[PDB]
């Protein structure tokens, strides 16, 4: 809505926003791998979501 069109805008948008996607991706993966690897009490229900 300022100075660009359609095809050119979506390229610079993902060029701007590639860093927060890989920011949240590695954090969300490494936060939920412990309940996907761990064994013990209730782990059979943790492995159904992790």
């Amino acid at each position: 809505e300022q100075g660009k069109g359609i095809v050119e805008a979506a390229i610079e948008a993902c060029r701007m926003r590639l860093r927060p996607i890989v920011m949240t991706s590695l954090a969300f993966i490494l936060g939920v791998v412990p309940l996907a690897i761990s064994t013990g009490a209730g782990s059979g229900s943790q492995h159904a979501i992790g």
Binding site: V7, A10, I11, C14, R15, M16, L18, R19, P20, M23, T24, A27, F28, G31, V32
Partner: protein, 151 residues
């Protein structure tokens, strides 16, 4: 906790982005950046609460299971947008006033300034990647239909 630390990291990158691309004042950086992010961040609340609200409407024995799941999510995500709109715009402007001099990841302290350059090479390859997606645009849309046959 995963979606609760998602929005704790999507809001500091947007305020350091204007410090990196423009060198703007770190007090007014929050008003410059989050003037167009406050709408998006309050709009993700009513979709991230709507993906959990009707599942807590069921009855029987599965209703007691499905409630206290979705309630424990919506209580986390309902106030996290409020604290993301109130607290961290002040805290990025008060307990963070960085002014970097000289280096841009070249020296960086030690030799670990190659990782951000590798990140720059991957996004420089990624813009060419999405340009090659937008080259013909027919096979990358026709592979979507053979994906949803999996569904």
């Amino acid at each position: 906790i995963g979606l609760l630390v998602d929005d704790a990291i999507v809001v500091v990158e947007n305020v350091e982005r204007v410090m990196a691309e423009e060198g703007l004042s770190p007090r007014e950086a929050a008003r410059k950046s989050m003037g167009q992010i406050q709408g998006a961040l309050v709009g993700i609340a009513m979709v991230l609460s709507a993906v959990f609200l009707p599942m807590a409407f069921f009855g029987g024995s599965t209703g007691v299971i499905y409630r206290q799941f979705s309630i424990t999510i919506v209580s986390a995500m309902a106030l996290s947008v409020i604290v993301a709109l109130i607290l961290t715009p002040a805290l990025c402007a008060t307990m963070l006033k960085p002014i970097e001099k000289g280096d841009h990841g070249e020296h960086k302290g030690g030799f670990f300034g190659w990782f951000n350059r590798m990140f720059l090479s991957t996004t420089h390859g990624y813009e060419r990647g999405v340009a090659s997606i937008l080259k013909h645009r027919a096979p990358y849309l026709l592979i979507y239909v053979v994906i949803v046959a999996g569904m």
